[PDB]
């Protein structure tokens, strides 16, 4: 029973693909030996950084290897672009009068 991606479970899948996509790069950068606890920790830096992007807070960190920071900033700019573009698309869809459901409005106005 492989379940398709639909409206309700879209953004959960977006999360999952993003997290995998970041672990791939950062694990392919680092030299070798130890990952898994380190693997878990890197993702917490990601999500924290996204929260910082939404709040317009800069997200500097004390000593962190620059390349990892490059990676995280790259993916957060991707996610930010998708987030903004959906914010606009749903908004014109609401304006012209088409049916936008309910929590997509309540969710939209937060984005805007």
């Amino acid at each position: 029973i492989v379940k398709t991606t639909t409206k309700q479970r879209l953004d959960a899948y977006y999360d999952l693909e993003l997290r995998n996509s970041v672990m791939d790069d950062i694990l392919e950068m680092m030299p070798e030996s130890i990952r898994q606890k380190k693997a878990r920790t890197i993702l917490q830096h990601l999500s924290e950084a996204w929260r910082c992007w939404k709040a317009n807070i800069p997200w500097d960190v004390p000593g962190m290897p620059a390349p990892i920071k490059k990676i995280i900033e790259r993916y957060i700019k991707s996610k930010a672009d998708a987030w903004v573009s959906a914010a606009h698309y749903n908004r014109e869809r609401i304006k012209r009068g088409a049916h936008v459901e309910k929590t997509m409005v309540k969710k939209n106005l937060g984005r805007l």
Partner: protein, 337 residues
Amino acid sequence: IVNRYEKLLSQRPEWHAPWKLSRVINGHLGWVRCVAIDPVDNEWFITGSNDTTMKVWDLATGKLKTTLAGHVMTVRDVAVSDRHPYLFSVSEDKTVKCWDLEKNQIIRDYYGHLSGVRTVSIHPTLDLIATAGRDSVIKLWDMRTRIPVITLVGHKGPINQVQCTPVDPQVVSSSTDATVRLWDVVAGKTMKVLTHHKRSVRATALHPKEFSVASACTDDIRSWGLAEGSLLTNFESEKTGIINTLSINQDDVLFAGGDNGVLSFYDYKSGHKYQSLATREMVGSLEGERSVLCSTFDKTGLRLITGEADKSIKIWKQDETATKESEPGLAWNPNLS
């Protein structure tokens, strides 16, 4: 043995011309994940994207023709058929969709992947498709009946890339377990396993003529002869990692795009690196956004198209002046181990 390595200075490999940037096409709202070109006429190319669309770009003028919607998540890989008027696209939404080009609409969905599918390869002679993804398997689809006929079990990790070849091994696959496997599809089992890579293998390209395959990893770009499966050459690389994309020109030119933005051209026969460039990112971008996520050569082989993480397509043209006035490349030093 080193007496031969004394003679290994007698080859002095194959001068080639330098590559430069001809044109830059903006127009994509996300990253540009994948690029495929019309295999017959070199008239236009197709472009996967983060923003879920596909755009058909006119190749001669770089103008835009039409946009193709239809996926809800990013489009990771794209293939256009030599023998059919079909476009096969694949996404992270677990779906493999055909696109009939004549009418420009969706035709056939192929169902039954567990999770996101990052690669599509069209078998040259059989009217099959090969797709693979985070599911760690390859599925061979009957193109007509949309049946997952053959499932090749194998890699212990997500499969990055899939290729098709007319004779034995018909399926070459490269996963993140650092194994390039060569498949026998009729017996459904692996013909040969190529383990020499240290880390995940994120790119593989097939040579248009020689019948061999190139693989890539962080620091290492190898080649492999098919049939036997032997190692053939190595490609000299300082730490260029991460190698996202490989492409092979008809002229034994081998392009390897990086995640650092550095484009690295090689000579396929020797394993020599005759150039290195760096893209000029964009007006308002970040140094993080300078990189290369895909690539191809058109059928002529004189123009390279690489979509980049800055939401731009860049068409890299080969210089007409060239020769040895001042080409000379990085100049052949065979260092030792």
